[PDB]
């Protein structure tokens, strides 16, 4: 009754969401061939949120896979759960963007979107009451950061009064995988601020130290990194498809952590993360969840809120759970840390509780925190953008494709106006009106 | 034939009604199938001649995930299928969404169903509306519910039971925005409105019922016992009856004064119920105790300006008068000077019933107090403070303006109850 | 159109006695006595003659729907007993502000009683 | 009325089972049809081995 | 001063008007109200009753 | 706690006293008591 | 001795008479063979062999819908010469069905009507089943009424018409046939009830809990209305009604003869187990706009006249107490010149249920026929649809090529222009 349309962009998008369509298939009890093999009866009560009915009592995901290269189209299909997607939803071009945002936005991605919008309009109009769209992509590439942001600009004009979610993978200061990473990052965050309802900032180096220091894995391959972000994507939508005591969908969260339309950058986190050697040394009750959830080690963005200021905080719980300790722990963490929170918003924490735990676990929680310290990310990108733009460096790949020199100037000016906006909300005055 | 229509709006109203109608079925001897294994049930159930009983209540909400438990749970056959009204998309903790956009396509169907229950009734005492201030449906759609019900029915009693936002702990961020703008509608379109808050019931269950962790299941049972204690004079034979119209008149002295406080006593575990006697004097000082208040506010700062006592079980009128004469001589308890006779009593014979899995004990006698105080003025100075503190920089207002309401309503709703705050001290000052 | 009293069994046929709790259409208590025949004022098809006065109301009705009612509905119980001369004036101005709701077929009709 | 309602529920169940059987039959016929299977023996002269259909 | 600009854009704005929609069934079945025929629209047309 | 100076000049909606002098005397007695 | 000849013209008429005559046989206990396993004299004719023949005439211009009647279960029931089939259908054209094709078979159908009417010792009237959107249901019906008024002088005639829905339909040129039938029907008809396919779709989905209805599901609900209308003609009751009766009390002016039908209760067996229904609760659902089977809200208009038909274990006083409750509701409005706007009919026999149906066994039921001013918006919208096509000469070469003249379109629009002016001035208070 409240459908979510999934769409995936780039090699990063098609390898993150492929894990995402495997974790909720196990949650709802779906084998790789498609049919239902489970024990509970409320697993089929809300399955139309992510699945479409097919003949013979099997189900297909309501997702589309978008790329500019057939390299990972051939690999996602050949995966474990690769035979569950509809083969008509695979759309791919024959020439890659090649880590170039201009090719992804103006030259190579300007013709594929004529085919992508037909598929996503076909999938969205069948829904009786659409909730919104959900996109996974990375800003460090060409086909995810270039064409994926053009899909956002086209869908927002077509469907204005809907919900847009972006689980964007922002660049990291230390991995340094691509030389032109600040160019693709600067030109895409400028587009992301104007036509997006909710944005989550996933960083790769903040996923590396969790798998090294918290989870204690010897080899943290990309299968383990994508399980972390898929657990957050499943936990943010758990009140939509599973019953509970206090429910909250995406729209009820979006109206509470977004006080101004330009303030929609969030910080994900997943609380029950323990290793085999320490899973018997500690219990996992509600105090232990909220002790690890607010901890800066657990957070999925590579910038510390201890240097910042919490604007608004969310927390969605799972499993059959008492109400009094949930409210007690949330009130206690606000009252003791009286300096890390804003003062012009009282009761910064919004709470939801679901009754169905994730598989293999009895109790769980997730974190969504809108913080002022996210401006550390944009200033770090800006100083690398403005360092290499003084020299006309790497411009002949961009300005040779119909791009002027003024797009880079306005992309950094509005981004500089963005960090000036976040700063004044942090240092806003106390108990005083204005000239308004 | 003294029948009351129950309205359960919001997730809180539905979840209250699950425990409330579970209590009523055991009280009159009704199985969950809706049949029998006296006509005291006639005020809540309608006799189908095949032997079935149908409650005269509606369950209205804007999301399907709270009522689909009722349609599949153990009371799936008792309720009428068409009395469980379900929307598609929730208000999402918004007032303008639940008032101007989403509240208007269902107000046709709700008033259609209420008209059918009103036609079935042969004597109507009033409507009982259950909602919470901090929600979206309870904030928005209930404001349309009272406004439309005044148009359709002129002077019918509108008793309201509200989940008031607790002072320090709450589950929302735009909750003060939702709670300012519901007062302005409910000042003139509501007859009486009892308040409880979740934080005070948490303190009662922690200290009295020797249980550390309650959930919403065993707070709704306590609320159901209060509603049963009010209605028990209509249902069962008593030595002195009280109707719904009586304490409406007896608790509202002025048009802006319709906010009484509900407290219950005794409420104890089964281990301590062996060990304590429960006399009429011992239960009439517990409700006067500020630690046993079900609203997080101390009435010692204020002054009692009307009271109402409802007694159940083995109770003697002589010991009632001796108890009230005792509580009038305490200098800690303060009344206003213009209300010398500030009490109203009611006596019923049948003791309270116990449900399986409940936390309360089997007690022969109990009391339910509805007290109107002046100590709400501190509870609105705090709530105007936190509304102001986030309205100064105009936060979260683009969510409200963009759904269909202009900016002028925020200044109207703040100004109206700011004048009301000057009104409470004006009543409170003695001659 | 017009209800007529039975003049001894009228108590048996009132609104709340017949289980209708909304406000009522009026009842004609007294009956006027005519004299002689009546002049005919309409055409064969039902058109009114050119010489007869015509009311200026809506010929279809005065029913007011959900999306047509005022956003701030005035209350049905209005007493100006203990209010100030400015607050009671504000309430009666709020009552007077919308004439469409008062004369409608639904028609919330407030009864202003008392003085401030 | 209760007995009649039980009969109606039975009819609805039988209708659903018939629908699923029809879907399976249609899938089998499409998976064996010449147009999708691309059978190379469709293009053969009936009375001549050397000749082929144009 | 982003506080002042945001507050000024808030105060100098007009609320959008929602489209009239009605729901009939106990389950939410949203239908438009204007073209359904339950609201008089074509009565108020110009050529009503005149050639 | 704190309220806007904008919402501080609003009056009182009810009157509930015979004359204004009695109201002022009662307010003066209340200020002396508190 | 009282009896009625039903005539079913068009595919809509044949498919609605198939379910109507199925209900009649189950009601009177007639086998599909045509023999018993004296109230049937109003709908069946006795043969010396004892076989019962229906007094109905099935008319169509194509054989693709009569042939199922000629092959299926009721093959031996109907008379072989009562199923009249032409050669080529009218194909959604009024001019084809009225001038060039319907002329060939009108002499054959009038011969058959005369042979059935020869057995009429006492005849009440005719019942007509047709749709406004089809070629044969509109074109052939128009000159059938024109010649039947000449042939039979003052015999009562009743129409059960299917009105085009405001939002869905099955044809493009359907408002041309709707106006070109209404213009003739205003002068050559006695009474004409309408029913709308879209509104029964909403009724069947909302109340009967049928998610995917079919025309076979719609024909049972309409067939129950026909049975309750002619119920007192066959069964005893406290207050009897006749076809001459509820004709007079619903037509105040000879230009307005357009009542709307309503039936209550229409519920399934699951919902009937929960809710008990006295006659007060079934007469409060007739005035409900959610239960009207014509897509128009009567609250925006004014009631001209009403007629109530009661079946089953029904008490005269409890009917009277419920109507006085309706009379004192502010929402239900009447015009100022009908101080007494009701009519009741009481019957004893409860409605029967067919096997494989959707309705349940109920002790009592009610049928409502109401004349409402709020139908003027249906004519106003249908006026605009005809107005908007005809300004640019759309589909007009099809009509003029058959033989009708161009000036018939301007004359028909001129006729309903005065009809719309009539609906206002009637509802104007003095
Ligand atoms: N006492 C009590 N309060 C409850 C219960 N359930 C919810 N609430 C209150 O409801 C408030 C949240 O609003 P909800 O009622 O859950 O939601 P809503 O009113 O339907 O509005 P939406 O959130 O838009 O759907 C919380 O602050 C709780 O205080 C309950 O079972 N018992
Ligand atoms: N209510 C109802 N209407 C029907 C049914 N069958 C057909 N109709 C109506 O018939 C209209 C179309 O006419 P046709 O079905 O073609 O039959 P016709 O009137 O003889 O027209 P022609 O076949 O061209 O001669 C549709 O708009 C339907 O509204 C039915 O079973 N029930
Ligand atoms: N979190 C996560 N990051 C990934 C994954 N696969 C690739 N990446 C990151 O994405 C970067 C390359 O992005 P790229 O594939 O060029 O994006 P594209 O051009 O849009 O397809 C690498 O540095 C990886 O760190 C994955 O499965 N999960
Ligand atoms: Mg809600
Ligand atoms: Mg035909």
């Amino acid at each position: 009754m409240r459908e979510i349309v999934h769409l995936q962009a780039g090699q990063c998008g098609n390898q993150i969401g492929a894990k995402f369509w495997e974790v909720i298939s196990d949650e709802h009890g779906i084998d790789p061939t498609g049919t239902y093999h489970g024990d509970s009866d409320l697993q089929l009560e809300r399955i139309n949120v992510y699945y479409n009915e097919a003949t013979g009592g099997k189900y297909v995901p309501r997702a589309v896979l978008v790329d500019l290269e057939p390299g990972t189209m051939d690999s996602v299909r050949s995966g474990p759960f690769g035979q569950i997607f509809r083969p008509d939803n695979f759309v791919f071009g024959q020439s890659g963007a090649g880590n170039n945002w201009a090719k992804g936005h103006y030259t190579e991605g300007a013709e594929l979107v004529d085919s992508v919008l037909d598929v996503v309009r076909k999938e969205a109009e069948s829904c009786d009451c659409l909730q919104g769209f959900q996109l996974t992509h990375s800003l460090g590439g060409g086909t995810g950061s270039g064409m994926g942001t053009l899909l956002i600009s086209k869908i927002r004009e077509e469907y204005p009064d809907r919900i847009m979610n972006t689980f964007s993978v922002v660049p990291s200061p230390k991995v340094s995988d691509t030389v032109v990473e600040p160019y693709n990052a600067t030109l895409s965050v400028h587009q992301l601020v104007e036509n997006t309802d909710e944005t989550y900032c996933i960083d790769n180096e903040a996923l590396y130290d969790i798998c090294f220091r918290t989870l204690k894995l010897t080899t943290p391959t990309y299968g383990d990194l994508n399980h972390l972000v898929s657990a957050t994507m499943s936990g943010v939508t758990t009140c939509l498809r599973f019953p509970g005591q206090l429910n909250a969908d995406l729209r009820k969260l979006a109206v509470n952590m977004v006080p101004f339309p330009r303030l929609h950058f969030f910080m994900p986190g997943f609380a029950p993360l323990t290793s085999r050697g320490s899973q018997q040394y500690r219990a996992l009750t509600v105090p232990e969840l909220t002790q690890q959830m607010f901890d800066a080690k657990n957070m999925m963005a590579a910038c510390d809120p201890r240097h910042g200021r919490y604007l608004t905080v969310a927390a969605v719980f799972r499993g059959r759970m008492s109400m009094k300790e949930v409210d007690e722990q949330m009130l206690n963490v606000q009252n003791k840390n009286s300096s890390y929170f804003v003062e012009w918003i009282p009761n910064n924490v919004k709470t939801a509780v679901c009754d169905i735990p994730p598989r293999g676990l009895k109790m769980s929680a997730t974190f969504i925190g809108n913080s002022t310290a996210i401006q550390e990310l944009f200033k770090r990108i800006s100083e690398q953008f403005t360092a290499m733009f003084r020299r006309k460096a790497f411009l002949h790949w961009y300005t040779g494709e119909g791009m002027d020199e003024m797009e880079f100037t306005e992309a950094e000016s509005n981004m500089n106006d963005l960090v000036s906006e976040y700063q004044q909300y942090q240092d806003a005055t106390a108990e005083e009106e204005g000239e308004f | 034939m003294r029948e009351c229509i129950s309205i359960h709006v919001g997730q809180a109203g539905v979840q209250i009604g699950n425990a409330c109608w579970e209590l009523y079925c055991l009280e009159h001897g009704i199985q969950p199938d809706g049949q029998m294994p006296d006509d005291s049930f006639n005020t809540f159930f309608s006799e189908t001649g095949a032997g079935k009983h149908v409650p005269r209540a509606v369950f209205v909400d804007l999301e399907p995930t709270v009522i689909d438990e009722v349609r599949t749970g153990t009371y799936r056959q008792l309720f009428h299928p068409e009395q469980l009204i379900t929307g598609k998309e929730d208000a999402a903790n918004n007032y303008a969404r639940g008032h101007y956009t989403i509240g208007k396509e269902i107000i046709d169907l709700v008033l259609d169903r209420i008209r059918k229950l009103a036609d079935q009734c042969t004597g109507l005492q009033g409507f009982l509306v259950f909602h919470s201030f901090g929600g979206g449906t309870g904030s928005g759609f209930t404001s349309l519910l009272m406004e439309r019900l005044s148009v359709d029915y002129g002077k019918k009693s509108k008793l309201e039971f509200s989940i008031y936002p607790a002072p320090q702990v709450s589950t929302a961020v735009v909750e003060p925005y939702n709670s300012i703008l519901t007062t302005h509608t409910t000042l003139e379109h509501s007859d009486c409105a009892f308040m409880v808050d979740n934080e005070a019931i948490y303190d009662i269950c922690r200290r009295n019922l020797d249980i550390e962790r309650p959930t919403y299941t065993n707070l709704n049972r306590l609320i159901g016992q209060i509603v049963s204690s009010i209605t028990a004079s209509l249902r069962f034979d008593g030595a002195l009856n009280v109707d719904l119209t009586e304490f409406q008149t007896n608790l509202v002295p002025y048009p802006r004064i319709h906010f009484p406080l509900a407290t219950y006593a005794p409420v104890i575990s089964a281990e301590k119920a062996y060990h304590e006697q429960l006399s009429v004097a011992e239960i009439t000082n517990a409700c006067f105790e500020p630690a046993n208040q079900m609203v997080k506010c101390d009435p010692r700062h204020g002054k009692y300006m009307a009271c109402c006592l409802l007694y159940r079980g083995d109770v003697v009128p002589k010991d009632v008068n001796a108890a009230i004469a005792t509580i009038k001589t305490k200098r800690t308890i303060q009344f206003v000077d213009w209300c010398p006779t500030g009490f109203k009593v009611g006596i019923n014979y049948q003791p309270p019933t116990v449900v399986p899995g409940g936390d309360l004990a089997k007690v022969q006698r109990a009391v339910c107090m509805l007290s109107n105080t002046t100590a709400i003025a501190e509870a609105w100075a705090r709530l105007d403070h936190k509304f102001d503190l986030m309205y100064a920089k105009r936060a979260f207002v683009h969510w409200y303006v963009g759904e269909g309401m202009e900016e002028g309503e925020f200044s109207e709703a703040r100004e109206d109850m700011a004048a009301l705050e000057k009104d409470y001290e004006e009543v409170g000052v003695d001659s | 159109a017009t209800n007529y009293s039975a003049n001894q069994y009228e108590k048996a046929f009132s609104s709340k006695y017949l289980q209708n709790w909304s406000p009522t259409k009026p009842t004609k208590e007294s009956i006027s006595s005519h004299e002689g025949y009546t002049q005919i004022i309409a055409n064969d098809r039902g058109h009114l003659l050119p010489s007869v006065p015509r009311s200026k109301a809506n010929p279809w009705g005065s029913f007011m729907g959900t999306w047509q009612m005022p956003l701030k509905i005035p209350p049905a119980r209005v007493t100006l007993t203990s209010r100030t001369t400015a607050g009671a004036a504000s309430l009666t101005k709020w009552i007077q502000k919308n004439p469409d709701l008062l004369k409608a077929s639904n028609g919330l009709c407030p009864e202003i009683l008392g003085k401030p | 009325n209760k007995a009649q309602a039980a009969v109606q529920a039975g009819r609805q169940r039988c209708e659903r089972q018939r629908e699923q059987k029809a879907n399976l039959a249609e899938i089998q016929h499409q998976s064996t049809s010449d147009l999708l299977t691309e059978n190379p023996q469709v293009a053969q002269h009936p009375m001549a081995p050397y000749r082929v259909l144009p | 001063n982003f506080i002042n600009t945001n507050a000024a854009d808030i105060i100098m704005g007009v609320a959008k008007k929602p489209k009239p929609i009605y729901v009939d069934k106990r389950t939410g079945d949203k239908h438009d109200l204007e073209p359904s025929g339950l609201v008089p629209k074509y009565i108020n047309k110009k050529d009503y009753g005149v050639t | 706690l704190w309220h806007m100076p904008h919402f501080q000049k609003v009056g009182r909606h009810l009157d509930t006293f015979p004359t204004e002098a009695d109201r002022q005397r009662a307010l003066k007695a209340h200020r002396e008591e508190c």
Side-chain angles (χ1 to χ4, degrees), chain B residues 333-385:
Chain B
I333 301 299
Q334 187 169 1
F335 268 69
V336 289
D337 62 358
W338 45 285
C339 188
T341 45
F343 275 116
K344 156 80 168 167
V345 298
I347 290 173
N348 193 1
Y349 281 144
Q350 181 158 357
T353 70
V354 67
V355 291
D359 291 331
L360 280 74
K362 176 170 184 323
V363 189
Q364 315 167 266
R365 44 183 84 81
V367 76
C368 176
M369 201 205 198
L370 302 177
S371 178
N372 197 188
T373 72
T374 317
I376 304 169
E378 59 185 3
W380 288 343
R382 179 156 53 252
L383 196 144
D384 292 343
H385 169 70

Side-chain angles (χ1 to χ4, degrees), chain B residues 69-279:
Chain B
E69 292 141 27
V70 179
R71 295 179 183 177
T72 309
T74 191
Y75 294 100
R76 93 179 82 81
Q77 293 179 356
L78 163 75
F79 285 121
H80 207 278
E82 270 146 29
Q83 272 164 11
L84 316 177
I85 312 294
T86 296
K88 290 288 271 287
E89 286 210 308
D90 62 358
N93 270 13
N94 211 317
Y95 185 65
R97 278 214 78 203
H99 209 278
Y100 299 90
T101 56
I102 309 302
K104 282 195 182 295
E105 66 269 16
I106 301 171
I107 202 175
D108 182 1
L109 175 68
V110 181
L111 277 296
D112 175 16
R113 186 49 57 173
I114 288 179
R115 204 61 71 61
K116 287 187 173 66
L117 282 71
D119 271 1
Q120 259 173 29
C121 289
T122 187
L124 188 62
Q125 293 293 349
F127 301 94
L128 319 180
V129 190
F130 299 165
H131 88 261
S132 52
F133 282 166
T137 317
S139 189
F141 174 68
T142 313
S143 306
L144 294 174
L145 189 65
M146 311 295 208
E147 271 170 343
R148 185 76 85 98
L149 266 176
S150 76
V151 175
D152 290 315
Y153 307 91
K155 300 291 180 67
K156 295 313 281 175
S157 307
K158 273 169 285 173
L159 280 74
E160 191 293 348
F161 294 65
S162 60
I163 306 292
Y164 200 105
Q168 51 193 309
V169 65
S170 293
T171 61
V173 185
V174 291
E175 182 163 354
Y177 264 121
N178 272 313
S179 174
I180 300 298
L181 274 76
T182 51
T183 64
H184 206 158
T185 300
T186 56
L187 294 175
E188 301 296 326
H189 304 98
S190 177
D191 288 325
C192 180
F194 318 114
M195 292 146 298
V196 290
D197 50 356
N198 284 1
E199 185 197 346
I201 317 175
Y202 283 154
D203 291 339
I204 294 309
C205 292
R206 181 168 57 77
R207 288 190 302 104
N208 294 337
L209 277 55
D210 71 6
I211 184 168
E212 182 55 91
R213 290 168 285 183
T215 47
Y216 286 165
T217 63
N218 52 4
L219 272 71
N220 290 318
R221 276 162 178 176
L222 267 75
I223 303 184
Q225 290 269 18
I226 300 156
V227 183
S228 82
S229 191
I230 290 170
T231 317
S233 66
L234 294 158
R235 292 185 293 179
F236 306 139
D237 195 6
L240 188 153
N241 290 137
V242 55
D243 186 74
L244 291 184
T245 305
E246 311 275 0
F247 54 90
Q248 178 180 0
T249 307
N250 285 357
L251 270 299
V252 174
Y254 287 113
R256 317 285 292 272
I257 311 298
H258 60 93
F259 293 90
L261 272 58
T263 187
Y264 192 68
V267 59
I268 47 174
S269 68
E271 196 66 274
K272 297 176 195 178
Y274 164 41
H275 188 193
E276 293 177 353
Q277 66 179 356
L278 278 297
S279 177

Side-chain angles (χ1 to χ4, degrees), chain A residues 139 168 170-171 182 185-186 188-190 192-193 199-201 203 262-267 302-303 370-386 411-412 414-423:
Chain A
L139 307 188
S168 63
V170 285
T186 303
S188 171
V189 176
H190 175 252
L192 276 178
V193 74
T199 314
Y200 303 87
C201 301
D203 218 339
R262 287 167 318 288
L263 300 174
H264 57 109
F265 286 81
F266 303 139
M267 281 198 160
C303 60
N370 188 14
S371 182
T372 306
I374 193 66
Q375 69 184 349
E376 279 188 15
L377 192 143
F378 304 119
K379 293 192 303 299
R380 168 144 35 79
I381 296 183
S382 183
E383 71 155 50
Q384 293 175 352
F385 181 84
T386 199
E412 81 176 22
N414 189 359
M415 182 179 72
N416 273 20
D417 263 354
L418 189 146
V419 305
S420 168
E421 159 178 20
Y422 292 169
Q423 188 274 331

